[PDB]
Amino acid sequence: SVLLSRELHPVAPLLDNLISALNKVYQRKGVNISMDISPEISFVGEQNDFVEVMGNVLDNACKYCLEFVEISARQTDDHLHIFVEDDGPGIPVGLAVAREITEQYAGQIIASDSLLGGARMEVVFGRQHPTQK
């Protein structure tokens, strides 16, 4: 009976002012943060959930890293993929919040090994079709 558009916010922008903030919180440590995300990649749903999840994950990344954090993302159709990898010792609680919010989006958080040297956290958000009802 009645289709609708869902709110789509670009991700690149949403993480930029979040990176800046972390930079300040950990300049003492010396953390270098890079992101490589195209301007077309976006998120569907409550922009605040995104930033709260990605704040939790990005914060945790900066803590366990040595000095490097790499951010990148890929988009499928009903799924949004965010990759956060660090060079700190790795992964062979905390993200509970990020886990709770990604749950509502039919997604999950996955840990694995990274090339840099540490954890390669992948955040997957679901329910990303851009239409509703």
Find the residue with minimal CB distance to ligand RDC: 64
Q: Which two tokens stand for residue 65?
A: 């890293």
Residues 6+ apart with CB under 8 A from 51: 14, 18
Q: Is 13 annotated as a binding residue?
A: no
Site map 42..71 versus ligand RDC, x via CB under 6 A? ------------------x---x-------
Q: Which two tokens stand for residue 111?
A: 């840990």
* Among positions 15, 42, 58, 118, the unique one binding ligand RDC when judged by CB under 6 A: 118
Q: Is 55 annotated as a binding residue?
A: no
Torsion angle (degrees, nearest 10) of CA 27, 28, 29, 30:
50
In 3-state terms, what secondary structure has residue 85? strand
Q: Is 94 annotated as a binding residue?
A: yes
When asked if residue 41 is in the footprint of ligand RDC (CB under 6 A), the reply is: no
Residues that bind ligand RDC (CB under 6 A): 60, 64, 86, 88-91, 93-95, 111, 118-119, 121
